[PDB]
Amino acid sequence: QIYTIIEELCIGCGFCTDECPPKVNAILPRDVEAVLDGGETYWIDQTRCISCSLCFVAGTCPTDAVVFTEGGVSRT
């Protein structure tokens, strides 16, 4: 399975990167390229993402962007 983040909907809140086990640090924060709005964005680094589907099943992500797929995507 895969867990991607829609970078148009995401607002750089933190409520995701918050799940990700520190040791793995899969969710990131590309920051500041002239932004008030959203602040930053937080894409999942595939090169290192244990895929515990923490992020996605924790519910909290206002905009709804933590995708969650494997053979067909569904968020909410």
Residue ranges binding ligand SF4 (CB under 6 A): 3, 5, 10-16, 19-20, 24, 26-27, 42, 44, 49-55, 61-63, 65-66
Q: Which two tokens stand for residue 61?
A: 């992500």
**Which residues make up each annotated binding site for [4Fe-4S] cluster?**
10, 13, 16, 20, 49, 52, 55, 61
The listed partner (other proteins, ligand SF4, none) that binds 59, CB under 5 to 8 Å by sort, is other proteins
Least distance between ligand SF4 and beta carbon 31 (Å): 12
